[model samples]
Target: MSPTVLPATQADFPKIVDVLVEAFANDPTFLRWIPQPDPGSAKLRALFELQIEKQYAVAGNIDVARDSEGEIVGVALWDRPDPRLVSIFGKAAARFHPKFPHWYLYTVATSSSARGTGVGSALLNHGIARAGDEAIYLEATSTRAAQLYNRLGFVPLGYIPSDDDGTPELAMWKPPAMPTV
Candidate 1:
């Protein structure tokens, strides 16, 4: 069954963090950011907790996908470009299309049990719909992820090499949908 997608509440924060911690435990970008004696350690959880609480939850949007049993199986974090806190990636993206507002897809993940069940795509499409005519930007952390983003209409905007592992994170953009007649 297709999972139901909904805007997450503060009460959903812990479960949302659990889903993201498990899903991104092995993700290259996350590994670079958090490093690993253990990806599921307290530090990693705290990092997500801070990002969710201080950043996305307050200033952006958090979408969760729940299964038939109402358990959160996937999560997506999105935010509008903030001039006060422009990231290196955000700055790079602007060079491609200066003067346009866009949504930044900071993170998206599906729990292991929910992988291959279309939860990820559903969560992404939920954000894309919410974005309306605004573009969406993200970095694909793996080749496989890049392929998935490609299938979803994101055009690659070259890569940014990671300082930690030297992995080339593929930057991608999905332009606003063309207006319908």
Candidate 2:
């Protein structure tokens, strides 16, 4: 059976942060963004914390997938396009996407137990369903992640090459949902 997917509350932040921290501790994209010699616990926590705050800034921007044991194993963070998203990450993120009014997928991470399962997609679709006619946007770091978004109807909007590392971040955009007859 699939894990339970639910909207996140402040009470869920700690476990959700743990889930994201452990999930992306070694991600190639994050490594270049915040390199470290250790498991990157500090940076991961810091980033996750900031992400949680951003989600709080905009209600319903975060959701969590909980395993059978009631432990959060997957997390997705999104923000409806606004100037605050730019100011939140400052130059670190907004420098790439100057546009607004779309659903900005800030980040999504799944623990090993949740990978290959439907947890990530569940959390993502939850946000997409609520997006209405607004566009959905995100910066995909890994090829696998990009492929997943592609399968879900997101197209590559552009490529932003990281000056720190040659790895290019795929700027993805999912257009407004089409009206059904």
Candidate 3:
């Protein structure tokens, strides 16, 4: 029931990239969203990685989730900078008031081999702790995901339409608990 949630080193970056690649390897819908995201291509993986790394200020590092074998099964990139001007959230993040700086749940992926094994949930829970007192935010890709985030205290704010063929993303927020226990 335990998991790791430390800041990442450069060595973990490849693992971060690998998780993304494996999770979306067969995602036709994801490919439709990012047309150039080729299946199983390390190059394409690195490209998507750039998008994630670019948000490091708000995006958490490769918070690797490991198993008994000491292998990473999932990861969550959580970020919560003081300034609200980070670009990772795009216009949606820009919609916030000038004074609001929130914790952003950027990218998280569990390898298919580890699906349904609680790795993703562990990542979410760990990321939640790292978010501290800031409100947590993320865009959900489906109702199932929306429900999951909802359970984690993230409430829907609006419908974030997806420009590509990928599923429409739901804009959501988890308010900061005043006395963050």
Candidate 4:
């Protein structure tokens, strides 16, 4: 059976960030970005926490997916555009063409155990549905994830060189959703 998606509360922050920490632990881009193996997990969690806290402060939304056993296995963090994004993510955004007004997809991570079990898909679909007809933007660190985003209607704007290891990350955008008949 497929997992179900639900709005994530402040109480869920730790678990949600834990899922993100695990999901990106082996991602090439992140591995390069957080190369210090000793403090990698702490740094990764801190980064995600900063992003989530800022987004939650505004009108940003966070969602989680849970298995039939009631354990959370995935998390999604998306937010309406905020000028402060530059303040929070300016260094990262500096590598891109430029930042502009668009709903931001900060992160979507599924537990390693739930990677192909539709938890990520459920969280992504929930994020897309929340976006309604507005554009959504996010960066993809892996070709596999880029492919998934492509299947969901997000196309690459281009790749931005990673400051850490000179690797490239895909910047993608999903235009407004079509109005269904």
Candidate 5:
């Protein structure tokens, strides 16, 4: 069955961090950012916590997908464009449409056990629905992820060079939904 997706509260922060750390442990882009010694270490958690506390929690929305037993099986973070912290791809995205207001899909992850169960999509769809007429943007680190975004209506805006690796990350955008006649 599909997991229940809901807005996460501050009480859910720790578990949300745990889910993100575990989910991105083996992700190539994540490994490049946190690198070696241990991807699942406190350092990674700190990084996520910093963003959660300093950024998303204050200016964005956090969604959690809960299993039948109430465990958080997935997490997604969405935010408005922040002038203080634009990503490399965010710069390119700006060129696509200068001064356009939109939502950024900062991070989304599913627990290993929930990988094929639609938790990620459920969380994303929840965010997209909340976004209403605003477009959603994100960077897809792998072809698999890019394909998933493609399925969700995101079109590639092009790729940005990775800081440490030759593999480029795909920058994608999902235009606002067209109103039905």
Candidate 6:
């Protein structure tokens, strides 16, 4: 796959959300996603409207991995969020005081069809490479997903219990001078 990872613009957000939808299609948390309770183009597009367009998205940071057909299949949404949004969408991030200047890997999703194809890892590496002087952070809710981040160098700091409307989260980190490599 010739994954053309690049910073996406407003036009790319719809497709970006599609990749997110596909990535989390059957995920337990997916059912609780703000818009997509029932999967469809409508809920999917609402995700972009409510999340992407509303949020203060940073450019040349959010990427879309495309297939040869020019369809997006993976993505990495990196941003220097105010740290409050985490708790807004996810109750877990609210409880944990995120370190300042945190390079939060907000969303990294690859279509189920594209799993095991290196797209996810590539996007992760893209974020990691750009995370200069900031401690990269993320909340992994699933063991399978956590394992992937762990394989890519994220270390578990501790646990964040779920709130009334959120799932439990693992607060993971990858320091700048990571791996001691």
User: How do the residues 1-181 of candidate 2 rate in per-residue lDDT, one tens digit apiece?
Assistant: 6777778887888888888778877777666656466454776577667757764546647778887888888888777666543332323547666466688887888888767778887788878888868898889877998999999889988889776675688999888767877
Candidate 2 vs 5: which has more TM-score: 5
Error of 4 at 57 (Å): 5.3
Using TM-score as the yardstick, the better of models 1 and 2 is 1
Pairs of residues clashing in candidate 1: none
Q: Please list the residue runs of candidate 4 whose C-alpha ends up more than 4 Å from where it truly belongs after superposition.
A: 31-35, 57-59, 82-100, 177-181
For candidate 2, the per-residue lDDT at 114 reads 68
lDDT of 6 by residue, 1-181 (tens): 5576767777887677777766766655545554433536455445544566655363325777877778787988776635434333433214474655567777788888877777877788777767765688888887887898898788898878755445687889876663755
Candidate 2 residue runs with Cα over 4 Å from true position: 38-40, 54-60, 83-93, 98-100, 177-181
Identify the candidate with maximal TM-score: 1
lDDT of model number 4: 0.77
Total clashing pairs in model 4: 0
Please write out the lDDT profile of model 3 over residues 1-181, one tens digit for every residue: 5555456667777777788788776665355534453435644465556656577623445577887777788877766656222222212214532246787776788888888788888888887887767787787878999999999888888876555456777888888767735
Q: With candidate 6 superimposed using the best TM-score fit, by how many Å does residue 144's alpha carbon deviate from the native? A: 3.1
Supply candidate 2's per-residue lDDT for 158: 82
Cα RMSD, model 1:
5.1
Per-residue lDDT value at 49 in model 2: 78
TM-score of 5: 0.82
What's the lDDT of the predicted structure labeled candidate 6? 0.68
Report RMSD (Å) for each prediction in the order shown: 5.1, 4.3, 5.6, 4.6, 5.0, 5.1
Q: Which candidate, 3 or 5, has the higher lDDT?
A: 5
Residue 141 local lDDT, model 4: 74
